[PDB]
């Protein structure tokens, strides 16, 4: 499906402030803090792995993401003025 | 097997807007009473913003 | 009314914390340098060793033993050198 563009910029805000994220791998439900379905987050953070912004470390039914230098430096020119 | 196609509205956007003298925009096709003034309801008890919720039969 | 409670999984490091606090509380408001010793608690599980269905079938039971001591010494504002121990699970109510 097409993740709505109002939800994409929502996610790129939490990556700047917190610089991390934690995604429980299932299809049902909503994220705890962000009120976005788990199935939108799973579709969108397959493109932040092809670009080279974060790196996934999966452990026990949970995938921990971590921001990178090339990613932190890249999001500045889209959300920083 | 096979699926069904669709039909699009290119110029029907100008439903009843009638550009008259003094830019007298003639607005017809009254919208949903339970929604904003901009969401022109479908003909005969159907609405658009609500998938099928707003149903104003008049 | 102070009430110090201890609990941990290994015992060779729970006796130290119940003896190191023996002398740093000797010369203070409280006395009766002793600590009760309740009977331990046990939790058990039994399972198969074989990771499939081959061989002789062999069982093994695990235990989680938990020791715990008590302290009762009424004082008034007499500590943080109790919170500096690696394994014992200090409790202060």
């Amino acid at each position: 499906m097409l993740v709505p563009t109002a939800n994409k910029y929502k996610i790129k805000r939490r990556l700047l402030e917190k610089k991390a994220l934690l995604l429980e791998d299932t299809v049902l439900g909503n994220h705890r803090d962000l009120e976005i379905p788990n199935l939108h987050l799973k579709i969108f953070m397959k493109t932040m792995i092809s670009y080279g912004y974060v790196q996934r470390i999966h452990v026990w039914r949970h995938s921990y993401f971590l921001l990178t230098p090339l990613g932190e430096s890249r999001l500045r020119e889209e959300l920083v003025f | 097997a096979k699926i069904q196609d669709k039909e699009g509205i290119p110029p029907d956007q100008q439903r009843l807007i009638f550009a008259g003298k003094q830019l007298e925009d003639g607005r017809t096709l009254s919208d949903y009473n339970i929604q904003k003034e901009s969401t022109l309801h479908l003909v005969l008890r159907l609405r658009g913003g609500g998938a099928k919720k707003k149903k104003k039969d008049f | 009314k102070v009430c110090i409670d201890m609990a941990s999984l290994e015992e060779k490091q729970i006796n130290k914390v119940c003896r190191e606090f023996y002398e740093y509380g000797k010369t203070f408001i409280d006395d009766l340098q002793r600590e009760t010793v309740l009977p331990k608690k046990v939790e058990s599980i039994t399972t198969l060793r074989n990771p499939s269905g081959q061989g002789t079938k062999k069982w093994s039971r695990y235990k989680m033993i938990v020791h715990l001591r008590n302290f009762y010494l009424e004082a008034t504002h007499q500590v943080q050198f109790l919170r500096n121990f690696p394994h014992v699970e200090i409790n202060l109510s």
Binding site: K18, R32, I57, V59, W60, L66 | - | -
Partner: protein, 210 residues
């Protein structure tokens, strides 16, 4: 019950958070972790061998571990506190040597020149003994194992829990995974820092009449 119902949900969290730190601290000499869930800030201590590289400049790399450990434990943002430390003796940790033999096999060295570089780093630190095992497709398509011992070990008994130190590691070559196991015997220490402060149970020493 009550105490034996929280001591198992507390320990069930130490088994998972310990499983993540050793994957995000691979190339820094990770040694151990320790979790104390009764404080105002939940303490978490990490023993490593590269303190000024796990932290990162400005602590940019430490303020990520603190946010991921707070999401998991279900607490506020500033209610968990990570504290980094440094190992006392780099040569006596069996899990640090298990990965030093593993960064070499990804570095084109052969498994003989790499094993002997990690057996003499246990002699210099004054360890009683040290065994190593390597098993896989070492040099072909038929697999075998090879042992390398350089001292005194001990296998059965009750003191084995205190006197041995274990560590595993696997390398993903172009052929398939290889295994590595390291076991180190710590020296007796009356103070109780390098090794235990216990003599082995079958050592009898007779005093002098003076």
């Amino acid at each position: 019950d009550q105490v034996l119902e929280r001591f198992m949900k507390n320990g069930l969290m130490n088994a998972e958070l310990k499983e993540f730190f050793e994957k995000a601290l691979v190339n820094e000499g990770f040694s151990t972790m320790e979790l104390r869930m009764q404080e105002t800030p939940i303490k978490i201590i990490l023993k490593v061998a590269k303190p000024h590289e796990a932290i990162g400049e400005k602590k940019f790399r430490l303020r990520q571990f603190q946010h991921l450990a707070a999401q998991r434990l279900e607490v506020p943002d500033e209610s968990v506190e990570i504290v980094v430390e440094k190992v006392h003796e780099k040569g006596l940790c069996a899990l640090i040597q298990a990965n030093f033999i593993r960064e070499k096999i990804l570095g084109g060295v052969q498994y003989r020149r790499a094993v002997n570089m990690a057996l003499k780093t246990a002699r210099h630190a004054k360890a009683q003994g040290c065994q190593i095992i390597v098993s896989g497709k070492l040099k072909g398509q038929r697999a075998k194992s090879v042992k390398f011992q350089d001292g005194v070990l001990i296998h059965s008994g009750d003191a084995v829990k205190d006197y041995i130190n274990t560590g595993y590691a696997t390398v993903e070559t172009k052929q398939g995974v290889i295994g590595i196991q390291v076991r180190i015997m710590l020296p007796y220490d009356p103070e109780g820092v390098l090794g235990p402060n216990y003599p082995l149970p079958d050592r009898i020493t007779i005093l002098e009449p003076s």
